[PDB]
Amino acid sequence: MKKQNDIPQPIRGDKGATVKIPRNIERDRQNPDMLVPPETDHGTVSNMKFSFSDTHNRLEKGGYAREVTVRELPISENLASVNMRLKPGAIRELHWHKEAEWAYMIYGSARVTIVDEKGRSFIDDVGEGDLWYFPSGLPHSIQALEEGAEFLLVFDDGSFSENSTFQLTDWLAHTPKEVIAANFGVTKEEISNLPGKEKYIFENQLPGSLKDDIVEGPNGEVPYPFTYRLLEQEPIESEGGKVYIADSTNFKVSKTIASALVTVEPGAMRELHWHPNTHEWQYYISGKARMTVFASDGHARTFNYQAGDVGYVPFAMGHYVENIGDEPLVFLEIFKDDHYADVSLNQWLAMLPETFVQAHLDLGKDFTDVLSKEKHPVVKKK
Amino acid sequence: DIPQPIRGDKGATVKIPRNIERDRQNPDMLVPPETDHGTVSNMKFSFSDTHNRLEKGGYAREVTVRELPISENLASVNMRLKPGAIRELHWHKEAEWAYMIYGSARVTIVDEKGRSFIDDVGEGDLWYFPSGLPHSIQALEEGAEFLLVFDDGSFSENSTFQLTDWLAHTPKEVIAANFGVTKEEISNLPGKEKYIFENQLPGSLKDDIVEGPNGEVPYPFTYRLLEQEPIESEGGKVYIADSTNFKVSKTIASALVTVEPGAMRELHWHPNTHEWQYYISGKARMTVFASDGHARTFNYQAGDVGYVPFAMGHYVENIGDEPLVFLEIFKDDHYADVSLNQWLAMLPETFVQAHLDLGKDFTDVLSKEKHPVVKKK
Amino acid sequence: DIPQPIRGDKGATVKIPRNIERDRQNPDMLVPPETDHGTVSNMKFSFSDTHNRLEKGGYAREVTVRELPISENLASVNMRLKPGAIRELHWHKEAEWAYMIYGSARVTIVDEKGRSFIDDVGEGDLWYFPSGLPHSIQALEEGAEFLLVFDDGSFSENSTFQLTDWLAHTPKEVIAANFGVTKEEISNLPGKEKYIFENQLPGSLKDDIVEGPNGEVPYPFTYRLLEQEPIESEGGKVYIADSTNFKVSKTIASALVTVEPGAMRELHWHPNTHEWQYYISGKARMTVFASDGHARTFNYQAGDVGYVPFAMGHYVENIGDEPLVFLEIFKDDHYADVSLNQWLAMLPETFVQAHLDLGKDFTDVLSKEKHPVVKK
Amino acid sequence: DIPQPIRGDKGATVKIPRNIERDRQNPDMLVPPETDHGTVSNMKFSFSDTHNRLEKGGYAREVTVRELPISENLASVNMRLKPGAIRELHWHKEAEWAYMIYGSARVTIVDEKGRSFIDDVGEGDLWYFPSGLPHSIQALEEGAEFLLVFDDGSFSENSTFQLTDWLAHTPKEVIAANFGVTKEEISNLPGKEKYIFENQLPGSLKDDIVEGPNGEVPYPFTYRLLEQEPIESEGGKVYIADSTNFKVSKTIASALVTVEPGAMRELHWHPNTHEWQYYISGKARMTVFASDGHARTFNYQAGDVGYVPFAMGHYVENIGDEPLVFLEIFKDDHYADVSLNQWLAMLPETFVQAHLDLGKDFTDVLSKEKHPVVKK
Amino acid sequence: MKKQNDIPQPIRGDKGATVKIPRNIERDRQNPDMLVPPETDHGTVSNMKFSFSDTHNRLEKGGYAREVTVRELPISENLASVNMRLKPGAIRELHWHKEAEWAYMIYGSARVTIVDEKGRSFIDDVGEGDLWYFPSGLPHSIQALEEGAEFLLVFDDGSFSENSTFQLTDWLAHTPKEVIAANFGVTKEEISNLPGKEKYIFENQLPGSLKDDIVEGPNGEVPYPFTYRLLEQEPIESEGGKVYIADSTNFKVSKTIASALVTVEPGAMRELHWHPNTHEWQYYISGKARMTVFASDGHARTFNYQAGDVGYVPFAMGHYVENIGDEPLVFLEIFKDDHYADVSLNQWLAMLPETFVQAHLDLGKDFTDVLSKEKHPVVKKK
Numbered sequence A, E: 001m002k003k004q005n006d007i008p009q010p011i012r013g014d015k016g017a018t019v020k021i022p023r024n025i026e027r028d029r030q031n032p033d034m035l036v037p038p039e040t041d042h043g044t045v046s047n048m049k050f051s052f053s054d055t056h057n058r059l060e061k062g063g064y065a066r067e068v069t070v071r072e073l074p075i076s077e078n079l080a081s082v083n084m085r086l087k088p089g090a091i092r093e094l095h096w097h098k099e100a101e102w103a104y105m106i107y108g109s110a111r112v113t114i115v116d117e118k119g120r121s122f123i124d125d126v127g128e129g130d131l132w133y134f135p136s137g138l139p140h141s142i143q144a145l146e147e148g149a150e151f152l153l154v155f156d157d158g159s160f161s162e163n164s165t166f167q168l169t170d171w172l173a174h175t176p177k178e179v180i181a182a183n184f185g186v187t188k189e190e191i192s193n194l195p196g197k198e199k200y201i202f203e204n205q206l207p208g209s210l211k212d213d214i215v216e217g218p219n220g221e222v223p224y225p226f227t228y229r230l231l232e233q234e235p236i237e238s239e240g241g242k243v244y245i246a247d248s249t250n251f252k253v254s255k256t257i258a259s260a261l262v263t264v265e266p267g268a269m270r271e272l273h274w275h276p277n278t279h280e281w282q283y284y285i286s287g288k289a290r291m292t293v294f295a296s297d298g299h300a301r302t303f304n305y306q307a308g309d310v311g312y313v314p315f316a317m318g319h320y321v322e323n324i325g326d327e328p329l330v331f332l333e334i335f336k337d338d339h340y341a342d343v344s345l346n347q348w349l350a351m352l353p354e355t356f357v358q359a360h361l362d363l364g365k366d367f368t369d370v371l372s373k374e375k376h377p378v379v380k381k382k
Numbered sequence B: 001d002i003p004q005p006i007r008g009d010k011g012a013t014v015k016i017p018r019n020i021e022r023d024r025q026n027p028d029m030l031v032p033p034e035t036d037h038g039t040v041s042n043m044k045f046s047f048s049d050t051h052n053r054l055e056k057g058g059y060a061r062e063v064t065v066r067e068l069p070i071s072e073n074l075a076s077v078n079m080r081l082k083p084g085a086i087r088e089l090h091w092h093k094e095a096e097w098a099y100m101i102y103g104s105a106r107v108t109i110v111d112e113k114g115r116s117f118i119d120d121v122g123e124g125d126l127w128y129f130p131s132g133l134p135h136s137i138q139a140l141e142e143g144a145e146f147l148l149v150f151d152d153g154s155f156s157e158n159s160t161f162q163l164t165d166w167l168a169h170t171p172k173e174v175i176a177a178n179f180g181v182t183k184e185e186i187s188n189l190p191g192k193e194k195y196i197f198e199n200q201l202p203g204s205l206k207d208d209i210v211e212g213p214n215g216e217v218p219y220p221f222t223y224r225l226l227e228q229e230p231i232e233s234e235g236g237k238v239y240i241a242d243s244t245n246f247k248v249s250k251t252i253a254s255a256l257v258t259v260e261p262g263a264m265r266e267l268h269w270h271p272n273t274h275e276w277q278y279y280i281s282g283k284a285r286m287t288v289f290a291s292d293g294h295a296r297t298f299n300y301q302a303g304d305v306g307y308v309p310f311a312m313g314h315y316v317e318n319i320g321d322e323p324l325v326f327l328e329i330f331k332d333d334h335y336a337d338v339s340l341n342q343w344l345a346m347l348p349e350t351f352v353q354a355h356l357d358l359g360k361d362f363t364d365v366l367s368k369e370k371h372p373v374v375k376k377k
Numbered sequence C, D: 001d002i003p004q005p006i007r008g009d010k011g012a013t014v015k016i017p018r019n020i021e022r023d024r025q026n027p028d029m030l031v032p033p034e035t036d037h038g039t040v041s042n043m044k045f046s047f048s049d050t051h052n053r054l055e056k057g058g059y060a061r062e063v064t065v066r067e068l069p070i071s072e073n074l075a076s077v078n079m080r081l082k083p084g085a086i087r088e089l090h091w092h093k094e095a096e097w098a099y100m101i102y103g104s105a106r107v108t109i110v111d112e113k114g115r116s117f118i119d120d121v122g123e124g125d126l127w128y129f130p131s132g133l134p135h136s137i138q139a140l141e142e143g144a145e146f147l148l149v150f151d152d153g154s155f156s157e158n159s160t161f162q163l164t165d166w167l168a169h170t171p172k173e174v175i176a177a178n179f180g181v182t183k184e185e186i187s188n189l190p191g192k193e194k195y196i197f198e199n200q201l202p203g204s205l206k207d208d209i210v211e212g213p214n215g216e217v218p219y220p221f222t223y224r225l226l227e228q229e230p231i232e233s234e235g236g237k238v239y240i241a242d243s244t245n246f247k248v249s250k251t252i253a254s255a256l257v258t259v260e261p262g263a264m265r266e267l268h269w270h271p272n273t274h275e276w277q278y279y280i281s282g283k284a285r286m287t288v289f290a291s292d293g294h295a296r297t298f299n300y301q302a303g304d305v306g307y308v309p310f311a312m313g314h315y316v317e318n319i320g321d322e323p324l325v326f327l328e329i330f331k332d333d334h335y336a337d338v339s340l341n342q343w344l345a346m347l348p349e350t351f352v353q354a355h356l357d358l359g360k361d362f363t364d365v366l367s368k369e370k371h372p373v374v375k376k
Ligand SMILES: [Mn+2]
Pocket: A095, A096, A097, A101, A140, A165
């Protein structure tokens, strides 16, 4: 708990030394638990942290998009992410991709379209705290409404790239005109004005009312919505914060992505736990955190995170997420699976015979008496 | 005619010795569309460019990942049997799907509960043998020629597990003990496999059926594809068999497509998996759109294998005077596509116009009903 | 008493220094059947050829893909516990299946809904712990020795996540905050893992049961394999536990096979997945038929691991005077085989004759009923 | 003072919580050049974003392929030693190259012929230790801080072979037999490694020299880079050490580049191998041209690692008011580049004009002499 | 040094327990340091031991061949080995392969042939203790002389198989007769008696004198011999045994294999060392040994070896080879490199300032005074 000097130094008790070479003081201040790790860290652990601020931002007329992929964070082979921004009325061009796409609306609102394997369309407006999920290969679009929009997209393969989606106008620009004309029963003259290259993101007038955009068709309505109002659900409320979970059990279409939004008050922490199903991918919406990843065989490494950072926890590794700042800590947890699952350290030990736990920990009834059989994902410090 | 790789002011005459016959077969590759761009893997291979294994009773030649490396998940054998000839009892790690192009044959299969299924397959019929289940084929009075598709690209037709090869490589004492016979009783077992061999015609199917205490299989291993009602559009027909109707065909979804002269399988993609193609008859071109401004056109004719990687945009245009007939194969439990026309038809017209820089005259032509094969006007 | 690699006019005496004891254990490898041919990967490894991790309270040794590289999907630990000794609370990514060979033990497991299951396991019983669910083992009054099988070949017994190792590598401030205690209250936590440690015998199972707000688990994590009715053939018995009867065992299908002297697990293959084997007792040979004229025979005895890649033909012949007892393990939700005899029995007899160049005298012996273990 | 991702009519303000400090460090990434295009792998990682291993006597932090995956062939440790502190005698498979940034240290190495080399290294000096040869570092009176580069990206600083770790994991009977001593004589050996440990300052270099029957090493393992005459261009200086002058440095070619304010390492590429970079001081941007219309610009400052894959076009522009100082590292036996200016200068002027759609006014400025660092 | 019972048990002090399940007592007796490892072992280490007795032996008219490859010992990706036996006069059929081949003649003697890239032939007799080396792709044969022969072949790729060499008669059997006839200017009738399948190993009459077999040609003699008399060289003689080294510096053709024969008296040991160049592959000719492989980061595992065993030491790992029996221990060390190199622990420390070594080891002048600046590869116990 000893605090750093204005110029922090990698010193812990009698270990470490001052930095003698030119250095990045600003980044060191953001990474206090990396410049000075806990004494309990040990061994080689892959990097589990990357900042969107350290990525190239693709700027277009109407917004921007930047990405963190396996080429930035190689531990995350199964999940990649885009931070995308749209100005009011601007359109993310009709497109599809091999990966399924999950999204969280951080700021503003947007209208999405999607058409399914049966030719059925779903059109809906998404606001702050809402999600969408587009299954692999189904074509979709996003158009920001009057406030603009900024959102996080997560794709279920780490090798994604935002520059490799299949765009409507790119497909047509690379199809012979004779074939397009034959496809639609029109003349080549009727399609002479098709774009010669993709748009990707483009400015446009605001759309009208949602009701006026709904398209009915001969194949009927989709069975399940492609959007979900996460923040309208009743959260799991612990002493130190709240957890909102959306997986395929409640957000029915979201078959390959399970998700949670976690809020952690100052002085609180997402408790010690692990996931018995799959890897965790993280996005930090706001606040400041540290997390130690316990990797087995005496290996553990602590990382720091703040707004704009991606984190990762490989399958079954022990972890916690501690708020280390004065404001709420808000982050997303993402899993490539059909459901969310964790094992809580506290609940695990609480559900075992007390003398058996005592025999393991070399602690007494004073400790086992504090264990809780109810899981409290976010705990508050006393 | 002597074609040249010239398109407008681009290209030049060929100055070196060349293969004129192949150039005539590949007009859209010697002279690609101006709209092609970028590196795309090869998506075409001819069975005529493969080694044909000849045996007493027929032949078998294959296109695998060693010929067409983009196709890692699917491989194929073109097999021919003379009347009465037998493809020896065998099994393999891969599931096997088949389309009977010519003639007819009797198949056998035994399942993991010891139940046998024996049936005759004719032109336009399919079979599907799940992985590891043992089977045989015997051509009937007119012979048979058929296409086999295996759900792994690394297959080889020379590495199936053959009944007689197994026995030839098992100790005689073990074979004798296995069946409760003497070693002398099995002395005449073959020393090497047969693979394909000549034989007299079998009797009636009814007389070959074997009844047993474990009863009949719950689902048939054959399917009469051409007896089903096809999806009919202006330019042709589509017949689909996947696990929703051909119940056993869990890892292969299939379609037979017929395209009249002047018609085209419309612009679409598959949101589920890669497409593997076999061209039964006719002449076609297809452009594969691979994202990020990459697209490449290929030509196909009878005897060719094609491929479309997962989610790539494509169409199949008849470029000849005869019907174009081809198979589409997918390693999945169902067939699925997205039609470009239907997609745009199901969106607000002004939104589509904003994308395409076209007006209501174009959006008025879009159809909310999918028409897989369209006819030119 | 000195075997030589000679078969008729093939082979020769060994002229260099040699391992006569191992040669005597591997008669069908020093002198293979004439019917073997071609390159086949090794399908045989002995636990006696592995490093044994010794701890206060027992031991653990393993056969993994680093010992037997054909077995990429399955690995195994032979673990021994003295009376009362504890295999420390731990978890791992891999699912774990177990067979109790000797003695008995108490297991605990807690699931992802916070529900605990505690049960006693005796000889012939199994357990199955799904991936990532935390568990422990404690031997009862006789001690215990058992075989664990993990559904990835790259496992290692030294890489499990141990309760005390986790806590030893977590900041004390974080542990204290997690439980609402002071750092002083947790100062006595161990500085390193225990793994296996000695302990007094546990009390009655009834006294260990913990009730909780989330109720009981829906399916048990133990199974009394030898209490089931086996498939009894002429030459032995087969007991099967897969996800159809041992409901939790979703990624492991298993069978215990007993083969009398003079009997043999018949010629068959598996149309679903690879087979992993552990030889509990007795002596066997097996030929693996790998297609395209490739076949190789291997010898096995107590303590050996074997393997049969997906769809390869095989049999398991007792070559000794005592019963042969072995486990068959498959990474799948069910057991399945195709029997050579039953296959041919279910085809037209003249069609079989046309293949085999044998007559009705042979096809008349074929049986439409499957008999997994046959007697000579 | 609040930058925004806006370039003319493209982009927009950031509406979500953001990292303004990092955005200010990366102006050409928040607002890239209009000329960037396409997907390019990340080519930039900060040592400040790594876990620092702290020991009594100093620290070590690393950037490896697990942090910067484009760099598969090279990894790096920033190591700091207090006065007299010792980096424990050790070896590793990888060859090690080093640049002394601050202070000074004594190194030892023994070769495979039993010959020892001991030398003092000061600011601007290098060392190179071939793969597998054992060595140590001990800081002198001012302490030391230096950059180590290893010729495999999968390195880890926690995986080196340490003298005391080896002995702690060797049977005492074997150690005793090895040296002809009793087990009692070696009872005080450490039970675990030291890695970095505090120690009194060493004596004179002359007093440490050890003579032996195998003579002196043929080539020195240290090099006084900054004592060499640099290539001096209009905008800065370049000092090169590769196997042609630093004879032992067979797998690492290196250069120290200084770039004045308003200057730039010119447009060039390497026809031999990938470039790995460490930024000692100052602030830079670099565009990596990856072919087929792909290009991405990155920002660097003190403490950053950069990378340029084999043959990709690049330049390094000083974007600050202070000198820009960086290292270029190549896994090869020599340094080589092709300069864009010199290339075009050596071709017929009308041929260059036909390519560039520019006239004699442009081709007249081309120079047949290579100037690695140019001044605006 | 405590000895096992006739039925050994995995017990070390108060650690371990008796074996309660059916077990392989004979193998346990062969592996005393695996049933009861040193207390100093720790962590996961790949298997480094495999017995030729655990391999399928290919029997032919004239001899046998069995192999240990990466399919048996997966740590050894770069080296594989065949133990081959020939009866008097029997021929290992003319053949070639992609891998280079190195050989040690353990028993008997043989005549070898080889033809090089220039059409030059080399024919020579090899006896006990002699080597050969055949570069990749050059065709060769072996024919045993009057005592027969048994030898160890080592190939410089672990994926080798003895059943995959290119055999003269197999090539011809799979070439169209018209092509063979055209190749040699003969009729198809003249070649009708060519074999229909390969021979591999076949019986034959003893050859005549070597002098009568030598073939001269227009391209002259080879520049360097393909055989080497290892045991005729003066060995490095230490107190506890001898070392004979053949690498490309003395056996000039042996460009990809460096080799050593090591003899270790009872009570002696190949000292603690490592190799700074490459992995070590081992074959145990006679005797009984143990070796601990030190793999870094606190990882170490001990293995036992006896006649007929293959061992392995990955690049740069610390090791020693201790004789644990009453007879001499004789083994081969093989390296895929153009030279042999090691670093001796003793010599390393002997060449450093004594106080510096003392500061590392927490030992005094009593220890540093015993260090030797001369390398003694095999040391004898006092
Ligand atoms: Mn999208």
